[PDB]
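User: Could you write out the 3D structure of this protein bound to protoporphyrin IX containing FE? I've included everything you need below.
Assistant: Certainly. Input first, then the structure.
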Amino acid sequence: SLAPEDGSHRPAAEPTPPGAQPTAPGSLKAPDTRNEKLNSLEDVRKGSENYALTTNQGVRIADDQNSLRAGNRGPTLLEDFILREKITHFDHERIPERIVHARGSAAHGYFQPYKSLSDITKADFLSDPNKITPVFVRFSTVQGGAGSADTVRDIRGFATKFYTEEGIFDLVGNNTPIFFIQDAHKFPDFVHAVKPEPHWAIPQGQSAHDTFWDYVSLQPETLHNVMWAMSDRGIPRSYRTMEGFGIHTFRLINAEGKATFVRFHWKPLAGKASLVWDEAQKLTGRDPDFHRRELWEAIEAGDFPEYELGFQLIPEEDEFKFDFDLLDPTKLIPEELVPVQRVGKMVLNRNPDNFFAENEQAAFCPGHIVPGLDFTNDPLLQGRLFSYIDTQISRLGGPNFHEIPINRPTCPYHNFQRDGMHRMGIDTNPANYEPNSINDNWPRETPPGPKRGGFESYQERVEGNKVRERSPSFGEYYSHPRLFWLSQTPFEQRHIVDGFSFELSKVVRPYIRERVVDQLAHIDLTLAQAVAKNLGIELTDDQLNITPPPDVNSLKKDPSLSLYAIPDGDVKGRVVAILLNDEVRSADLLAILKALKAKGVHAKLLYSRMGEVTADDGTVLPIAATFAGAPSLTVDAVIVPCGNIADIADNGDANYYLMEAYKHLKPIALAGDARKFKATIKVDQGEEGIVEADSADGSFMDELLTLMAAHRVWSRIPKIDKIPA
Amino acid sequence: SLAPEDGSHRPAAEPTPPGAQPTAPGSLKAPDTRNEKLNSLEDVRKGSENYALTTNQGVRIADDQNSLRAGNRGPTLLEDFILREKITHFDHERIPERIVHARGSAAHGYFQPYKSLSDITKADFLSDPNKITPVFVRFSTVQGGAGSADTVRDIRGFATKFYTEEGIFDLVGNNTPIFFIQDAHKFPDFVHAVKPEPHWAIPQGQSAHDTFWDYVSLQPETLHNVMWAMSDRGIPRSYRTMEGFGIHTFRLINAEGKATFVRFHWKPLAGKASLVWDEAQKLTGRDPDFHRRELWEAIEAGDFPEYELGFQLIPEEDEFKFDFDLLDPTKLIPEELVPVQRVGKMVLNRNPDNFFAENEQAAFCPGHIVPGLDFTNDPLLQGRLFSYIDTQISRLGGPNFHEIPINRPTCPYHNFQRDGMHRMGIDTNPANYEPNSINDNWPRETPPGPKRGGFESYQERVEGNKVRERSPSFGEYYSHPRLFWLSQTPFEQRHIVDGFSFELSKVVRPYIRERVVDQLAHIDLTLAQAVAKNLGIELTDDQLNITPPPDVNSLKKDPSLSLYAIPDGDVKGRVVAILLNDEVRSADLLAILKALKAKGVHAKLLYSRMGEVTADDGTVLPIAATFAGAPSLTVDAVIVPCGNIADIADNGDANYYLMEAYKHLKPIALAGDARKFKATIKVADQGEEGIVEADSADGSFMDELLTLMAAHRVWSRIPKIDKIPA
Ligand code: HEM
Ligand code: HEM
């Protein structure tokens, strides 16, 4: 009898925009949204409604408020089995977090290819355009714990579990196309350096400390993935607005046994967008769950995250054609030399029911491949194949982690494997070995073949001695950092300079700072000088004379490496803050919202207090948040309609919201008297990125939506140093 | 060699101010700080200098950069035993974090009593003023994960491990004197409610979501601890600047067998200080490891955290002489009815060497008591006794967690317990059971005695029927929250109203907000009216007519419940930001620093870039951090000296630096042309209380600034920050 009579506790099982309703588990939120993986999970879902509360043994509980005691004011009794089971289960809730990418957010989806790829690979999931494969995707950061913030400067993980007809395929990618290290053997050294320092366990979610920059300074192979990290790539606006990459070269194998080299790409259909550092660092304070929240809400809204799977393809005879080793994971393949051809579409359309059961327990391993794919001798990748199965024995508590429901294949699985902790499968097979006659040798081996064949490795030639030795072909470190750098817009280049500058400023030992700078002189002198000047370091004459590295196969730049050089903006799923007053002009707010709804743009209505305001025309407006409660940090744009502006004109928080939005390069739109706010951000004829008009004209809504399509107002950067926000 | 020639890589083994040197494991940083427990760990401490790099089996590694592979562009081989060992170890580094109080920072220290307490207890470690007991202290939040932020709004844990001669005593406490719930049976319900919500695991380190307040609204026993939480107690300035409480009534037992009732207190020598919320929420962004870092750095500097252990003592016959029940842990004992007798002093004086080894693996339990102490029937505490041992099994991977070194007793430990995962002790006893004749029954039972006796429970009379039932004497929920609210300052009350309003602001279902407000009308109408207004709620005529709850044993208020009502200010260990310019007035700096050193106040010098600047008298000043890099959030005060003020006058980061500190009520001092900054903070020519100003910083200027800091924050300023866009 505790629920409200108006039924305001329950959300609607309808797509609703962010903040409209309580968020719910996905099967309640969207019961009609289905795929084969999600239908297969019905057998393990527990309901709640109209159920007696029980122990795990099915015994109904009379009193869930009290321990059993020898009297009212008595001591608690050992015999209280209901108390102890409840506490015992609570005391054992936690399991070890992932050693890396502990922080992650996940959703169910489906994948479909555009056309049969059966010419280049015999993988069943790429075999036909009508073949629809369920996926589960987890996006993550890298350094921080499960309880760390989302919008840190870090790499992001992009791992995809394809539940195919011929097995699970895990594509375990990152949001940059390279990694920091060449050889798996040094993964703990590099991960120990970026991680919090072992004496005092500081700092969390930050590469900005001494041990990371010490390692980078002594291992220049790192410098290419560090540039990406120090770029706006390091702080994305959303998981929906970043690129995914496989990073390693892998193989495709077709029915003839012909092997094609591949690199995997995810391209975001919503386009690439990133935060700026001041905004990102502050947002870890205002909303540490910002990416996790944004993603759940985009999906509850129907703003389904969409990505296009892309292949970079290289014939086997083309292995040595480039200036870099294809097996080197610190080098990218420029899109200018090898294009991405579109392979398929992935759509994330449903949230999970239980984060711990589905996200936290989900296990990806890049070793999970299917017939039609295969590895290469990329010596980072070779090392990963051992690690992902080893870690699950402790993290998921045994070798039966595949029987945990999220991890189960939809396709059939039968073998002679037996027992292990938390064994779920009860095998009826008389034989637990092959060859056997007592079960006629079932289940049986399948020979390799074009469809439904057994897995067989590509018969790659191996010649050479047993050595622990780095290929000399890997021993070039500066030319790809340089290609990346020259491919960036000038405003991206300052953001990179500022990232290096900020992080190095945090480094306590100055010699570590000086060595990182000396490494930068080897990539480009302009970038190297701009950092030295922010650190009060002066380049020597030797440093000034360092010859630039070769370009990569004759390229001066590649613009596919920039987030913004070629615009790809889509406003659908973006959010505007609307700053109300106590007597809002109804005409302005009516026009504003119908323009946003038309382009799938969301709004939140903000005031100095919660509850309701009334517009000039009597309309009751409910309030989503306070100006302090949902700061500018959390929106793409700000719109102030006309009304009793006097009401908010001297409001400290209302003026700061405009200044915070303005400093962070966001579009700002002012109608009527709202223009008087132009004084707080020191703007009168007006400027690019401030939309102003007598009323929210509809041309006014067109100017604002056009700016939102370009994501930020880069022209504004020269003005923001003056503004104290 | 990879190290610099100059030796700038190694910190000095002598105390230094924060930022002066790189931080170090405590045994490198302070090798001559010792106690019996730090000396006991010497057997497991592992050096690194001048040693061969080896496998765990002690095989020397020749090449630590490469997998073994067939050809230098070849596949990795299974037979590489060195790579697999390194990867495996890495692949298995994490253990589960604690279910609650996962986020924490800890340190070694000692405890000494002021005088022999054998009159009221036979606890050996309280027996003698010369008895020095080593400790390990862990401070924590409650809700957040091990990787969540320090300065969130939350309860803080204050756990103390005493290594006594008669066994380990863990006093496991929180920074408020009550808890949210009465019976341990509902702990999982309350924790599930305050924790991130199960569908999407949002939000981290916050109680500002629907399920916590849904529970608060439907369970009014919660309201007293919610009041402390919504107050500035929820956002302390430092672990050094908060109080500690055991919460439960415990028993002291003396040699004669007399039981005395006790509640435990930790009184901070550095005094009580707290953040403001806007400042604290932002610090979780700018520096989420702020409490952890400050603790480590205070100790590296020599500003030791110090606390006074205090007892509230109730003789057994007074058990019913309060109009609240002593065994209810949502109820507090007012220091006005029962004063805290300061009984001893604890000092935290050494950082650990390895955070995982000592902090993360440290296990505390309220069941770990020693002869001279006993329990009560407090039903929250009764439940705790089961849980602390139970999680330790999964979290530290078996029943041998006491053999993890930081957990080990310094006193002798011998029993018939055998085996278990990772058993370290090799037992030579021919017997693994008693009674035995084969070892002559060693080891042996000890009869209870005044000193070095066996533990025997206090023979408390039990009369009742087996019931799952809540004492009706527990069912009064508003009178302690009222006593707390009346005991606060007007600015403290404003901050509580703001705490409730901001958090209920983030509650999505308005009926939950209406419901929490209805509860506040049962506590106090003024507080209920101010929260409803901030939420656009109108109290009904009914809500307006709700009778206030009665006084607690007729106290009108208790100023011990307030952080600021009585000044306890100590500025030793605080920090000042000094905002530099490219030609600083040396006269201003020379006075600013001389006065801070004298009071033990730290300074970090700040500029628009790193490196150095030169003073007008030719002094080279090293820059500690940028304005952006060390925001106002991280300092107690800001002083701006004279020099070339034009250099930073148009600097947005520098103006905003002063605007943030002003909004957060911090003291600001401006000398000479620095006064030109008064305009950014909208201070008039006439000046205002809380802005120190003079044409040079001569003596009166610093005495004015340091006086403001003793008062911690400028409360008079709260009406003037409405009109600052910061
Ligand atoms: C290009 C290089 C790498 C990429 C792109 C990569 C990618 C990822 C991703 C996306 C995850 C998170 C999966 C999830 O969300 O659950 C992850 C986790 C992990 N990675 Fe990597 N990784 C790389 C290199 C390595 C290496 C060299 C090692 C060790 C040899 C390693 C060991 C692990 C482990 C232990 C986890 C946690 C495993 C688990 O509990 O499931 N990774 N990696
Ligand atoms: C007044 C009430 C309570 C206080 C003051 C309190 C205090 C604490 C503190 C300070 C810690 C952290 C210890 C550390 O740093 O290692 C802790 C941990 C814990 N508490 Fe509580 N607690 C209370 C109630 C409860 C209750 C009722 C339960 C369970 C029924 C409980 C279960 C736990 C558990 C399981 C841990 C984790 C311990 C570990 O993993 O080592 N607590 N508590």
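Residues A 87, 91; B 98-101, 104, 138, 140, 157, 159, 172-174, 179, 184, 187, 247, 329, 362-364, 380, 383-384, 387-388, 391-392, 395 surround protoporphyrin IX containing FE (ligand 2) (CB under 6 Å).
User: Perfect, thank you.
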